[PDB]
Design a protein around this ligand. Sequence first.
Ligand code: SF4
Ligand code: SF4
Ligand code: FCO
Ligand SMILES: [Cl-]
Ligand SMILES: [Fe+2]
Ligand code: NI
Lengths: 481, 277
Amino acid sequence: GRTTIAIDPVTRIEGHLKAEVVVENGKVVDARLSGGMYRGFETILRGRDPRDASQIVQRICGVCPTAHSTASVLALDEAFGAKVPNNGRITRNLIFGANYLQSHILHFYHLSAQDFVQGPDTAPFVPRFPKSDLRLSKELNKAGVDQYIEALEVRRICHEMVALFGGRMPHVQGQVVGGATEIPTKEKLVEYAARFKKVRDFVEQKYVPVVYTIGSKYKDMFKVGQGFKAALCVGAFPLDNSGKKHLFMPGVYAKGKDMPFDPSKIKEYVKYSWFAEETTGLNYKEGKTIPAPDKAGAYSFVKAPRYDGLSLEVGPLARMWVNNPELSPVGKKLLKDLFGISAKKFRDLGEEAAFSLMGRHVARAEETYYMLGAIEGWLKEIKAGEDTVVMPAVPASAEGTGFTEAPRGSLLHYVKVKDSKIDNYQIVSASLWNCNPRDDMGQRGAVEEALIGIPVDDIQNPVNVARLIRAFDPXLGCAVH
Amino acid sequence: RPPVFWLQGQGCTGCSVTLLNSVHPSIADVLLKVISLEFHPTVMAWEGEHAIEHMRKVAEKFKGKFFLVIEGSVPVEADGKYCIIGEANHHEISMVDALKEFGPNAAAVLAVGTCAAYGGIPAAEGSETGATAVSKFLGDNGIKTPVVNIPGCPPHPDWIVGTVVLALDAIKKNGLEGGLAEVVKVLDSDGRPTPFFGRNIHENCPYLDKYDEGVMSATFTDKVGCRYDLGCKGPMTMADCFERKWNGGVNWCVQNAVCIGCVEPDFPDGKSPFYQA
Ligand code: SF4
Ligand code: SF4
Ligand code: FCO
Ligand SMILES: [Cl-]
Ligand SMILES: [Fe+2]
Ligand code: NI
């Protein structure tokens, strides 16, 4: 009748995740996600010089540290009254934009591609499920392998681009309250542009085409994994110095309807989370982190964030859906050639196909393409030699919030400063929105709900369970912190 | 090909990402010919209890002969429940359990990253999880398996591949036993290889003259003066960043901003505030 399947560790994601699903008549009919590892950055940050935060918060997650760095300095800029020079804003975008490219490339090839591509007879590519449902021709499988290897060079080059104005990566030194620590010189801009060109080539010629092509051999995967079909974007990549227009404009989508994003509507629930019951339902500005690992009923160190009581998902899909940009020229051609679809903007594909397992991989590939244009824009806008930082004094009393989009979705950092020290620091991260447990009202998290209906016609090889999860690109370091 | 199991406790996966940045000419050979990376949750094909069972089967077949890479600290509070790394036979496996199971039967343990080496950020002021350095945990539990620390937050990939290579050479010359004896001959009192951590950043810093002159940059973007007043921790830090630099030689912390002493046992607390002398 009903079979429970627990997968711990879910692999080929970042961090510690357990998935437990119930399977009835060949489908997932229930799901619970557990983030199994906790560090407690929100309490570790208490009492430090607020400038230290932009270093500490990066160790939340070594795959997306520039997202945390960015959110933190934006929070500190606000709290310190610091006016980031124009050239510093652009430099920051160059540092952070380069890791979007690394992160999406890492995710598709090095995390996700083994879900569809058979690796060779060497560890860690073997052993695996005897019935792994790997459907690609010898030729397309070989392209998959060839590109996973090439991608190892490309993603490393991305990190080289990050380090040029960033200092090193993981964990940039180059972003601080007040802007960026190093003025781009003509020479180093030549170096960033030369590497960006090789990345651009790979994304256009290899990555976007392979996601569509592999996608075309797994069309059933566009029909499952919808969940709530509700999305959040909080905005990212300031495009002028006045905080108005952004590369990704904020918005919420739910039940077929677009609405504005109002961060006061965010509450984090803890009934099913290992935190003290009296801390449930707080906005981040009043957020508290009191761990309760023995609490009865709870099953995760991830809190449950709700927007106006809604369970929402985040990430490239959510951003591309909210913003609805033009599809890339590769996507447009491949949609036509391989799927028989003529589309012009992202939403032309329809809610059902966009919010599906494979739709999320396609949204990530498209967003990567969309990021090339933004970076090329910043490379034109940047001015060699122009100052990129101001040096503000630490205030005795202040508060600040930084909102941005991490490669995996919406991120914000709130800081409260008192006696020139951190009094409260709260983080609401991307994978916190996606991989969270039930809220106090028993409503499931986005990935939990997206698991409902996933096919498992063979309980001994239940491959689609981790496949659905991996389409969200989870990082539980971010989710839990 | 001896197996390697890569276990993550309280880490941020940054030690795996830094390794993926390696340009070391030996790295592909290490992974394809030298060892077999049999368990690594971020990159391996299999999952869950299947992955765990595979690790356990290989551990048994290679008892005494496999190597453990540990990334992240080990939290001991609340009976190990702040880090659960898997489940098999209906039993959650904490990082505490995993180290007590695999620790005794490994040939050696590489604690990669300042977390595993020394506690690092998860152990810093305000933390509540009992996060513990690998070597201390193993000792507290009477496990005598040798440990080498490769610290840094994250380490330079060449420090990781570098230590494997110097370990590989020591074993080829003298066996598993003679080999390991020779590697202690190059570890400092903090258990780290003196080839990478034997030299002080500040004594080898290109801005040393400015430091001696008393010329201090007042803003991060002034690349002419010493970074000391901006918070540079170079004077108290032992690493070769000044020479090899980071990410294919394109930059390093002191050129770009300041050194935060990421390789040192007191990181981060003893290095904080980061942006004041
Ligand atoms: S304080 Fe830092 S920048 Fe100054 S000479 Fe020493 S290591 Fe170099
Ligand atoms: S320069 Fe200092 S902070 Fe940067 S990697 Fe080296 S030791 Fe760590
Ligand atoms: N990308 C990313 Fe990290 C996550 N989830 C953040 O925020
Ligand atoms: Cl990022
Ligand atoms: Fe949080
Ligand atoms: Ni992350």
